[PDB]
Each structure stands twice: as C-alpha cells, then as structure tokens.
Write an enzyme that holds these catalytic residues in place. Structure first.
Site, mmCIF file in Angstrom:
data_model
loop_
_atom_site.group_PDB
_atom_site.id
_atom_site.type_symbol
_atom_site.label_atom_id
_atom_site.label_comp_id
_atom_site.label_asym_id
_atom_site.label_seq_id
_atom_site.Cartn_x
_atom_site.Cartn_y
_atom_site.Cartn_z
ATOM 1 N N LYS A 60 -0.381 -5.227 1.989
ATOM 2 C CA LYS A 60 0.912 -5.466 1.919
ATOM 3 C C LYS A 60 1.338 -6.790 2.225
ATOM 4 O O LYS A 60 2.590 -7.206 1.924
ATOM 5 C CB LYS A 60 1.638 -4.626 3.297
ATOM 6 C CG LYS A 60 1.659 -3.010 2.889
ATOM 7 C CD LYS A 60 2.102 -2.580 1.653
ATOM 8 C CE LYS A 60 2.352 -1.065 1.517
ATOM 9 N NZ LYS A 60 1.322 -0.172 2.256
ATOM 10 N N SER B 220 -6.929 4.994 5.367
ATOM 11 C CA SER B 220 -6.942 5.066 3.891
ATOM 12 C C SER B 220 -7.612 4.565 3.029
ATOM 13 O O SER B 220 -8.127 4.927 2.085
ATOM 14 C CB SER B 220 -5.270 4.464 3.623
ATOM 15 O OG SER B 220 -5.523 3.001 3.644
#
Lengths: 311, 311
Positions: free
Chosen positions: B42, B272
């Site tokens: 991100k 993840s």
C-alpha cells in the site's frame, strides 16, 4: 535475472532519504536498513556470516547454529538458517518478551530459555555449554568478532552509500553495537574509494565506553534504552583506528528523535535510528559540517519496538 | 543522485525471491512488498494517491486527508502525509488494537474513534461526516475507486516484475483487496509489454464474491482471517476484464502457509501472503503450469501480525 535463489541473497540495496526537519538545507540523509529481508541492518551479517562459514567449512549440512541473542542478529540468523536449511538454537532466558519468543519461534528457532537471574551472562554460558556438548555439530558465529560482519558492510553497505551519493558523502554517522557497520562502511569509502570522510560512532551517554576508552578514562558502562547499541564494551569488530569522532546521545533524546522521524518525516525508524539521527543533527548544525553531506544509518523499523518506550 | 526527496519517492523496487519448498523446480517466485517505506504494498498507492491529488489540485497545502481505515492503506497514507506535510485524520472506532492506535498515533494521525457498534460502517459514515463539515478542507482519497491506485502498479510494480524476470513471467497471482495490484500489474504486462500471461486473483473461500459474481451466483460475503483481502464486494479498482482465473483459499491454509514461508523459506510474510502463496502452489503443481514462471505478490510483513492468529 534478478531472482534471488533464497532470501539471504536479497540483502541490502537500501534507499537514502533526505531529511526535511533535521540538518541544514537537506545536508542529512538517512539509509533505511529496515528495508531488508528480516527488517534490519543485521540481515547483511546474518547472510554473510553464514556464507563465510560455509565457504570455510565451519558450517556444513547437518551442523547447527547456536547464538546467545534474541535481537536483530538472532532474527537475521533465524531467517538465513530457515532459508538455507540449518537448525538454529538461540539462547536467551525466560524473561524475554512473548512477542520475540513468538517471532523467533515463528522463524523456526529452537528456543533454549536459560535462567532469568543469569540474564545475558546465563544465555551466553548456555550457548557455550551446547557447543561443548558436540563441537562438531554446533557452531557459534560470534557477531562481535567475526570479520565477515564488517566485511559485508565493506562490500555492500559502503559501496551503496558511495554510489547513491555519487561519492559526495562527507560524513557517515552510525550507532555502534558490534561496530561492523561503521567499520565496514568506513573501510569501503576511505580505503576502497579513497575519500577522507569523517566517520562518527554513536553511543549512549549512559554507557559511553568508546568515548571513555579513547579519552584514557575509566570505562563505566551503564543501563540505557537505546536497543541495539551500547553493549558496555569495545567489540572487536569496532575498528577504533577508522573512527574520527564519537558522539554520545541520551535515551530520552534518541526516543524523541525516533518519534519525530515517524511523525515529521514519515520514516518508521527504530530507537537506535533516533540516536543516530540526533547525533547527525548536532554535527549538521555546526558550521564546519553545514556544507557537508552527512549519511546516517537507520538500523531497524518502528514496528519492532511497539512494546517499548518508543510508543 | 539516488537520494529520495522524501520517503514517498522511495516506494517499490522490491525483490523477487525463488521459493524452495513450494511449486515445482523453482517455478514459484515471490515479490516482497513488505520491503517498502511503511512495510506494505500500500505504500505505493499511499504515495501515488497523494501525488495525483496534488497534480489535479484536489490536495493542496492546508487541506487535510480523511480516510476510514486502520490497515495498510492507513499506515501508507500516514507516512506520506507525515513526509509531505499534511494532517490526516483516520477514522476507525474504539475497538481497534492498542498497537495499531499507537502505530498510527506514532505516525501523527489525528485518530477519530467512532462507535464500536457501527464498526467499519460507523467509521466510514464518520469520515463522510467530516468531509461534509468543510468539503474544501477535507479530502477522501478513496483507495477502492481511485484510478491512481492501479496506475501506480501499472507504472512500478508491473514493470519491476517484467524487468526482474527478463519478461519470462507467465502467471501473476495476487490477493484482491482494492484490486489495484492485480489490475495495474496485469495492464502493464499484458498491454504495455504485450505478453498474454495468466492473471490470477485470490480471495478467501469464506467470502468468494469474485468467484460467485463471475459464475453468476448469489454474492454471499462471509468472515475470514485473511487480513487485507476479501472485502466482501467487487471493488471498482478490480478490473474483472483482465482476470483470467480466480483461486479461493481458506483462512487456516493461508495462516499455515505464512508460517511455512517464515519457518521453511525464511520469508517474514503476512497472512494474505500465505493465501497468495497457497493459491500459487496449487497452480504450480498442475502440469499445465509446471514449466511456467509464477510470480506472487506478498503484500505485507510478519511483525504487523504479532497480535493475530499468524502467531
């Protein structure tokens, strides 16, 4: 081409970021060693100490790494041991944080938790005991004295600073734990690239054993909160001969400075990164250094310090 | 030359590491997005969403960023806001972890803690309320729909994969949160470099809304533990048109796989990352993909998950 055969080969190539709220007109630049496989400067020496021990036959398939550490070096050797297929036992007593136990356990370390009373002394003694048990099975890599520590900094960290600054680096400021960073970097820039920079070691004012030694004063170690530096003795891997200056920083200032790096620069720095920056900021604001490019090692990242006074 | 003016410019150039205990004869390679300024994928979109909003005049000196998030995007926007001199308010209620509150507070976020009962809905509604209060002072950058999200992946992440694999990448596997990664990467490789790779989105089997949508079945989101993916809806920034396959992974397997990456590969992967690897491992072991180079995005690092089921 640029696919690393395991995570150990991916060490380094860490970026330089110019600080905006420290130094004078951008003369302070920081090298983010948190950007490494196991998120610290020690990833470099984890990699190189294992590689060198392989090349010299001291580490072979079947032999097991032992080390009395739970810090950055422990995490570095853990990732490398995992990547390269070695069992590793780290010795640290029972009083260590659940978080670190979980992190090292997560990395698959055989955790041996010594007597808390014995502390670091206990853990070291216990590491030595297991080497004793089967000296042909166990290997202690000894970060404080192993030349493969400064050598990796001479081959990677130092050249990266040279290249990234187009050889304009005038000053390197690095906290001293093992001394490998400042040693390796200094050797690279001064001896390999031939530039007469100012090498600045940083230590806690609470435990200024380098300053005391060089002044010919009584060595008086003390407790401090600047994790990673200030071991309370002169490590063999600190080449005092290449150190031009020693700057002392107090724990409160180091902590406040790390918080400023986060909140004011958007740099997720660890505690010792705050110490190194505060020392570099002081030099940066002396007229003698104000037109000089100061490069500062930031050894670790903030999230490793969530349980600590940093937050 | 290579000195970044602030930490936002230092995004990306993350390494590829070949896995040894997944895939078939090294056909699975992972991109370590944990190696970023704020330690996740991100960081790229934090940087680019701010930069784009600056270039288009929606973000100016004095305006304040608002976003209903406490995750990786929140941390990314926090570091960028700090680096570039913006106040940022993140809205998340009171039930969030002390650790994350401390991390974002450390990064200097104005924390607005909404009603716990309202949860994500509460936080979103409250973010919207503050934009309402002074729409010329507040800006919501909207990671799920802002094109600057996939665009940064098209300009950086995708080209890095192309270059690092010498254009041999055949398959990209990426979990879907906003969808920006798989979208941007896929556009780069397929449209900019012209190679007809297999783009594989990954979602939790517990909340397989992409799979259900594409099958024309009822969309039934559900809870899961794979933090960062499985938002429970199709985000605008997921270009379904470039997705060739969707692989579902369960929480237990994702968690076990992250633990294996740590203990067996020495890769400090987040949850993840375990999901993406398990999905890539499955494709890697189908004869159709066994002579194909599979590149897998690992979005985050382990230490961000110490309070979680990962440990």
């Amino acid at each position: 081409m640029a696919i690393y055969a395991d995570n150990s080969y991916s060490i380094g190539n860490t970026p330089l970021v110019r600080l905006k709220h420290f130094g004078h007109n951008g003369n302070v630049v920081v090298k983010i060693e948190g950007r490494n496989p196991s998120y610290s400067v020690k990833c470099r020496i984890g990699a190189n100490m294992v590689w060198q021990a392989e090349k010299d036959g001291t580490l072979t398939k079947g032999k097991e790494i032992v080390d009395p550490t739970s810090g950055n070096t422990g995490i570095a050797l853990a990732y490398v041991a995992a990547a390269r297929g070695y069992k590793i036992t780290l010795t640290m007593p029972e009083t260590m944080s659940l978080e670190r136990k979980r992190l090292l356990c997560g990395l698959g370390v055989n955790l041996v938790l010594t007597e808390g009373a014995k502390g670091m002394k206990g853990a070291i003694a216990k590491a030595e005991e297991i080497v004793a048990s089967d000296p042909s099975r166990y290997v202690m890599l000894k970060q404080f004295e192993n030349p493969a520590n400064p050598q990796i900094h001479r081959e990677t960290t130092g050249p990266e600073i040279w290249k990234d600054t187009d050889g304009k680096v005038d000053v390197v400021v690095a906290g001293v734990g093992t001394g490998g960073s400042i040693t390796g970097i200094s050797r690279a820039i001064k001896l390999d690239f031939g530039k007469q920079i100012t090498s600045v070691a940083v230590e806690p004012v609470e435990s200024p054993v380098i300053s005391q030694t060089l002044a010919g004063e009584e060595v008086k170690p003390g407790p401090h909160k600047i994790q990673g530096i200030g071991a309370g003795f002169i490590p063999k891997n600190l080449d005092l001969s290449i150190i031009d200056r020693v700057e002392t920083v107090d724990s409160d200032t180091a902590l406040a400075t790390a918080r400023r790096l986060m909140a004011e620069e958007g740099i997720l720095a660890g505690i010792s990164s705050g110490a190194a920056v505060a020392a570099a900021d002081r030099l940066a604001k002396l007229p003698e250094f104000a037109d000089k490019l100061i490069v500062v090692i930031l050894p670790s990242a903030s999230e490793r310090y969530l349980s600590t006074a940093l937050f």
